[PDB]
Structure 1
Amino acid sequence: ASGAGKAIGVLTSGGDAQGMNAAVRAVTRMGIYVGAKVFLIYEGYEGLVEGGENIKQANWLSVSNIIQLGGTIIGSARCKAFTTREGRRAAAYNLVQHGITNLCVIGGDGSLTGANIFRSEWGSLLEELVAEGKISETTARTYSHLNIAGLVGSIDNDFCGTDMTIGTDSALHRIMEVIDAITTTAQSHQRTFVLEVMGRHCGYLALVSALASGADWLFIPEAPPEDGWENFMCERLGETRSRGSRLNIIIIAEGAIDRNGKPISSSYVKDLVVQRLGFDTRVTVLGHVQRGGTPSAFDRILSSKMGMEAVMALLEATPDTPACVVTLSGNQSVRLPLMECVQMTKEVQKAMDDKRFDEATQLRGGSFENNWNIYKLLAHQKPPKEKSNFSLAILNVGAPAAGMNAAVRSAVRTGISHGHTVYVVHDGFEGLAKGQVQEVGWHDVAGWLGRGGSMLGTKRTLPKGQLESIVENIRIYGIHALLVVGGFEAYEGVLQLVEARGRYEELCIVMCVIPATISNNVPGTDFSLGSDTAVNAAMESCDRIKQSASGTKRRVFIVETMGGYCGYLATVTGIAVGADAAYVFEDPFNIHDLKVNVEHMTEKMKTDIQRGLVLRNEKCHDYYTTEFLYNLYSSEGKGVFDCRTNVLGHLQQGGAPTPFDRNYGTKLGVKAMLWLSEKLREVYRKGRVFANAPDSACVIGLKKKAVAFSPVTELKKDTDFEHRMPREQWWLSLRLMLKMLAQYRISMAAYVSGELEHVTR
């Protein structure tokens, strides 16, 4: 099973997408964990060509304390030598000199295209190399096959076969840190903010930035504006002024063009807005800033996961299996053949060159086209000449979670677009009982994307106590559907209404639960809305705490995270920060395990690493509290390290939503409203709505691959109501990666890696 006797090469090439260091760290540590030799190839294909000093064998400490670093410690370089066979043969030679039959390439589309051509010629290169006399025929029959596992490291997301790339989330963090600087101030003058984003051929970042910020207009190469857009944009900005909206946001990709080949410059859009509107218009150009900063939490977790999965795919690969790209479609890890992804990239590039240009946007991926349609739908109120008798109420239940507001905004716009009469109830089920129901319009949710917490009130109170009041208010307001955005209490309350349908006819209404909570403890989904924001805040605190020793003193920090009995937040945060241990309820630990971990920390702390970090979930243990662990670690670490403690309380809660949470809540709010409309039309009979089947009350998912709708009655089997979490959680396999990255020898036969999948046309 172990990959002993074989060597893995890891290199980065192209623009240094942040999160590459996390991927390199996971590749290295998994490679030497499974017994393989790991060789770090510096400057990418440059150092592959020159080789020699640029190829160095890695140890465990070579990738220590880099997971929080942006860029790449390996370094990347553009080399033309790898384009030609003269340098590519030298690259194959240098791999043979170290016995590196296994290569991990972490780069963009050009990097992975070069890796594909390098595999395709590996036999021919070796043949010509032995023919020229630089390697004997023996020592060439071995190494006859080169194994390539590709990782897409780029902010562009230009590789068509793959849905998400390393650094996309963090590039968007940079973009939204800058846009939040504009939108979160008290707006004074009438002004226009034009953001030039650094996508010269792919407009994905411009699109998700526009969706996350609620941009007024978007220029992307995938969908150039129609003729006469000059007037249409200026008029849109004009009615934006008439609305009283003092700020306009224009997102313009570097690759922005018109229907012809002529590029549209940010300066042109500036001067255009200045001339026709007179708004205070300044262009913001991020430039190198997009590749800057720390990697986001998502980038660190996913880079770690894909780096580990890259190594494992590289060991289980026979001479016959093709070069693969390890990626995630949805939450599911998957391997795609390198050849097909390169072919799709060539097809979209040819289509974008005025071949199938109107039909190039679909080949970019269904997610791109759907994101652009959602963006345009939410951007401007088109006139809904259609109308329906249906009316729906939107709840916020539980604790506040970052991204509830984004979900409610999208649900409101989408429901109004479908002709529904949208209500919002303040304080959740409390307000529904008390009748705090307020009909809402398009602009009542204006600017709700970036606002953290809950504009509508949230309450944890379950509906069973005031069930008579809830049915009364549903009858009064004619509520035909119910959209509940919240945590475990949201699911539990909708479950209580479904179970009470037998008693009350009025509760036979379509229900939908959008899981929105810090803890990620809601059954039926993998990611509750706002868990990403909490993870990002928690790691940022842990990074700050871990930096406080500044390399001199050697110290261990016991950090306590929230999440109730759900350990998700602790474990992913531990992965993101390189925590030695994340103690959680789902993995019960006794004093024997604590002594093992403390001795493990002590041994590590005598080595070069000086900053230790163990996380503890707030409800992991009844007795071994944070104070207990502090006393334990400080006693047993006497004369080796000092111990400190930091209980992250509501530092993980009140932050504004991360760009993932904004886009995520945006999308599933739309999807919940689409599903609500379809179910309500499917259930409307005899002149009234009567939703009695279990399928009419679902939790909108995203459970493995795509969005799902799990009936609440069916999820009741897999729900631990005492602990307020599901019984089987997908993320417990990430504990093995967490422990492996911390030198814990754990037999991870239970980890499942994504298998080969062909591209979805």
Structure 2
Amino acid sequence: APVLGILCGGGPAPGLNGVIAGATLYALRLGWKVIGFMEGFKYLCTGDVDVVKAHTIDLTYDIVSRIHFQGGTIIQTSRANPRKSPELQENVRKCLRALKVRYFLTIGGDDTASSAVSVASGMNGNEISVISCPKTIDNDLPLPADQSTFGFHTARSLGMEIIRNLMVDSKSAPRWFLVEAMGRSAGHLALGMAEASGAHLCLIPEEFKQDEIEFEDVVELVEATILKRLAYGKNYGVCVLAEGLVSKMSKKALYKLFGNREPPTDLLDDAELARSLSEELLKRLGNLGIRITPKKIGYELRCADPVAFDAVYTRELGYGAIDAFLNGHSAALIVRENGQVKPVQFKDLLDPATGRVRTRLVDVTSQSFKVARVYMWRMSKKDYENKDLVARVAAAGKMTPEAFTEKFAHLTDVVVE
């Protein structure tokens, strides 16, 4: 009876347990023995056969038969990475061989799969075969457009519900919420939350023409939306911001981001973008009876119980991983393109630019992105050319139609219309 070894690396995503139970349940039906390494590679890195034994468990039918309802991961996860030093990988090989592992499945992000292949490449193919199931809550893998990664549906739906309450609260007690969606990689999650909840505005790094952002431009994009809605008798709303704006700002923009101060280094995590915009917008707009409050959606999504779409999705990835093992595949990533859970070789998907896996961003030319824009509140190219509109909007700001055009009309060159 061969041995299967599963582990999780990187941040958790809803439905992580779904993959573990999908692979384990099918493997047990074949008669395999399944084990799970706690906290990813953290203890395989030490190379101590008994420190590892104290941190691996039997993945039995009883353990996994009902985890498909539950978020997080029963075998935990960690960012521990054996790929960064020649000693660590050998410690991994020493423990896999000592554990008589035959099939090796990892569930994790771009940095987690690379560890799997590197440890595998220094091992005989007849003794160990490696498979990985890439995971990401930011929906940034290069699957065919409109196709989502597992966990993304759960994250977007819970985020919609959180913004729903902020939408009702912003109207009931007039204010503006600046909701910062966690995740600097792409803009899929911020735009999905905003469009589903009817958020009045969404800013993502992908909608900016210039290769760097200026702090003042982001202030004016939000300031224009607040002015236009105020011009229609509404002093409240919700604006959603992808954190990826941070990783695109310029050096000067980052300096203003931290309060006109030099930023720390080894550091965009310490950045507080929604909070910084709230302070600047309050100096400019507070006199108009406008309250602004930042709010961060984020960590609370990572271990939400999977929605039905991600339950089916992850189970089919678990079966697929075992199926790739049976069909002899190795060094491949389990993906579902066009409704087929097929093994895909990491070479065929690794974009040569960054070395890591190709990251699919939001297509702001697609119609889907255009539809989201129609239901937002923003001054378009045509809007600035409407004298009657510009008159009311500038009046709402207690500025003249002229000063308003000086300040804000340039924004049509910062963001794709």
Q: Specify whether residues 199 and 243 from structure 1 end up closer, same or farther in structure 2 by C-alpha distance, changes over 3 A only.
A: same
Residue 303 of structure 1 and its aligned partner are, at CA, apart by 0.9
Please give the alpha-carbon distance, in whole angstroms, between the structure 2 residues aligned to 1:268 and 1:158: 27
1:150 corresponds, among 120, 125, 132, to: 132
What is the 5 A alignment of 1:311-350?
311-317=322-328, 321-343=329-351, 346=354
Q: Read off the aligned partner of 1:86 and give its amino acid letter.
A: E
Q: Provide, for residues 215-271 of structure 1, a one-character-per-residue CA deviation record: whole Å limited to 9, x for no partner.
A: 333333344476644334312221122224453222122332355354451112212
| Separation of aligned partners in 1, 2:320 and 2:5 | 15
Name which of 20, 25, 29 aligns with 1:33.
Answer: 29
The corresponding residue for 1:174 is: 158
- Equivalences for residues 421-460 of structure 1 within 5 A: none
Contact 1:161/1:345 (<8 A) preserved: no
How many Å separate the matches in 2 of 1:344 and 1:171?
29
- The equivalent residue for 1:260 is 250
Structure 2 residue aligned with 1:53: 54
> Is contact 1:224-1:256 (8 Å) kept?
no
Partner of 2:112: 111
Q: Could you say if the C-alpha distance between residues 282 and 380 of structure 1 is closer, same or farther in structure 2, counting changes exceeding 3 Å?
A: closer
- After TM superposition, the structure 1 = structure 2 runs for residues 394-413 of structure 1, keeping only pairs within 5 Å, are none
Q: CA deviation at 1:294?
A: 1.5
- Cα–Cα, structure 1 residues 174 and 298, in superposed 2: closer, same or farther, change >3 Å? same
Amino acid at match of 2:139: N
Task: For residue 111 of structure 1, report the CA deviation from its aligned partner.
Answer: 0.9
- Native 8 Å contact 1:195 1:252 kept in 2: yes
**Contact 1:109–1:158 (8 Å) recurs in 2:** no
Pairwise mapping of residues 709-728 of structure 1 onto structure 2 (< 5 A)? Answer: none
For residues 225 and 36 of structure 1, the distance between their equivalents in structure 2, rounded to whole angstroms, comes to 53
- Which position in structure 1 is the counterpart of 2:95? 94
Equivalent residue letter for 1:306: L
Distance 2:298 2:363 in 1: 26
Q: Of 8, 11, 18, which aligns to 1:12?
A: 8
Alignment of 1:531-680 (within 5 A): none
In the alignment, which residue of structure 2 is the partner of 1:233? Answer: 222
Separation (CA, whole Å) in 2 of partners of 1:116 and 1:19: 23
Aligned partner (choices 200, 213, 228) of residue 184 of structure 2 = 200
For residue 118 of structure 1, report the CA deviation from its aligned partner: 2.6
Change (3 A) 1:27 1:173: same
Which of the pair has the greater relative contact order for Cα pairs under 8 Å at 6+ separation? 2
TM superposition shift of 1:31:
0.8
CA 1:293–1:142: 2 relative to 1, 3 Å: closer
Tell me the alpha carbon deviations over residues 642-661 of structure 1, each in whole angstroms, 9 at most, x when there is no partner.
xxxxxxxxxxxxxxxxxxxx
Q: Give, in whole Å, the separation in 1 of the partners of 2:110 and 2:17.
A: 19
Q: How far, CA to CA, are the matches of 2:357 and 2:6 in structure 1?
A: 28
Give a deviation string over 1:203-223, Cα, whole Å, max 9, x none: 321122222223333333344
Residues 157, 117 of structure 1: CA spacing in aligned structure 2 closer, same or farther, 3 A cutoff? Answer: farther
Aligned to 1:251: 240
Bigger radius of gyration: 1
How far apart are 1:369 and its partner, in Å? Answer: 5.6
Q: What per-residue deviation string (whole Å, max 9, x for no partner) do you get for residues 151-174 of structure 1?
A: 122323344458532221222233
Give the equivalent residue in structure 2 for 1:191.
175
Q: Which residue of 2 aligns with 1:490?
A: none
Q: 1:365 to 1:77 in 2, by over 3 A?
A: closer
Q: CA distance change for structure 1 residues 306 and 207 in 2, over 3 Å: closer, same or farther?
A: same
Aligned position for 2:66 = 65
Match of 2:281 in 1: 273
Deviations 1:672-699 (A, max 9, x none): xxxxxxxxxxxxxxxxxxxxxxxxxxxx
Who is 2:376 aligned against? 379
Match of 1:270, as an amino acid? S
More helix by share: 2
For the Cα contact (< 8 Å) 1:109–1:342, is it kept in 2? no
> Whole-Å Cα distance in 1 between the matches of residues 319 and 123 of structure 2?
25
Does the C-alpha gap of structure 1 residues 225 and 37 become closer, same or farther in structure 2, counting only changes over 3 Å? same
Secondary structure of 1:256's aligned partner: helix
Q: Which amino acid counterpart does residue 335 of structure 1 have in structure 2?
A: P
Alpha-carbon RMSD: 3.0
Contact 1:157/1:168 (8 A) holds in 2: yes
Cα distance in 2, alignment partners of residues 345 and 245 from structure 1: 46
- Distance in 2 between the 1:270 and 1:333 partners? 44
Number of aligned residue pairs: 347
Structure 1 residues 64 and 182: alpha-carbon distance in aligned structure 2, compared to 1, 3 A threshold: same
User: What is the alpha-carbon distance in structure 2 between the residues aligned to residue 202 and residue 367 of structure 1?
Assistant: 10
Q: Does the aligned pair in 2 maintain the 1:19–1:303 contact within 8 Å? A: yes
Cα distance in 2 for residues equivalent to 1:348 and 1:192: 38
1:373 deviates by: 3.9
Does structure 1 retain, via aligned residues, the 8 Å contact 2:207–2:364?
no
Query: Any idea what the Cα deviations from partners look like across 1:525-568, whole Å, max 9, x if unmatched?
Result: xxxxxxxxxxxxxxxxxxxxxxxxxxxxxxxxxxxxxxxxxxxx
Task: Report the AA paired with residue 376 of structure 1.
Answer: R
Q: What one-letter code is carried by the residue in structure 2 that aligns with 1:24?
A: I
Distance 1:175 1:349 in 2: 26
Q: Percent identity?
A: 23
How far 1:304 sits from its partner (Å)? 1.0
Distance in 2 of aligned mates of 1:274 and 1:49: 50
Secondary structure of the residue aligned to 2:354 is helix
Aligned counterparts of 2:321 and 2:356: Cα–Cα separation in 1: 26
Q: Which amino acid aligns with 1:43?
A: E
From the superposition, tell whether residues 93 and 218 of structure 1 become closer, same or farther in structure 2 (CA, over 3 Å): same
Please report how far the alpha carbon of residue 190 of structure 1 lies from its aligned counterpart in structure 2 after TM superposition. 3.2
Query: CA distance change for structure 1 residues 349 and 75 in 2, over 3 Å: closer, same or farther?
Result: closer
Q: State how far apart, in whole Å, the 1-side matches of 2:55 and 2:86 are.
A: 20
| Kept after mapping to 2: 8 A contact 1:195/1:284 | yes
Gap change, CA 1:344 and 1:367, over 3 Å in 2 = farther
* C-alpha contact (below 8 Å) 2:9/2:78 kept by paired residues: yes
1:49/1:81 contact within 8 Å kept: yes
SS of 1:267's equivalent? helix
Q: CA deviation at 1:112?
A: 1.5
**How far apart are the structure 2 equivalents of 1:15 and 1:102?**
23
In 2, Cα distance between the equivalents of 1:109 and 1:247?
Answer: 40
SS at match of 2:27: helix
State the partner residue of 2:317.
Answer: 306
* 2:321 maps to amino acid: A
Structure 2: distance between partners of 1:61 and 1:335: 28
- Structure 1 gap ranges (5+): 124-140, 351-362, 386-761
Q: Is the 8 A contact 1:107 1:153 kept in 2?
A: yes
Secondary structure in 2 aligned to 1:67? helix
Which residue, 209, 216, 221 being the options, matches 2:193? 209
Task: Please name the residue that 2:404 is paired with.
Answer: none
Q: Deviations over 1:11-56 (max 9, x none)?
A: 1111121211111111110111122221212111113334323233
Task: Tell me, yes or no, if the aligned pair for 1:48 and 1:55 is still in contact at 8 Å.
Answer: no
Deviation at 1:348, TM superposition (A): 8.2
Alignment check: 8 A CA contact 1:39 1:58 kept: yes
The more displaced of 183-192 and 262-271 is: 183-192
CA distance in 2, matches of 1:366, 1:180: 23
Give the counterpart letter for 1:336 in structure 2. V
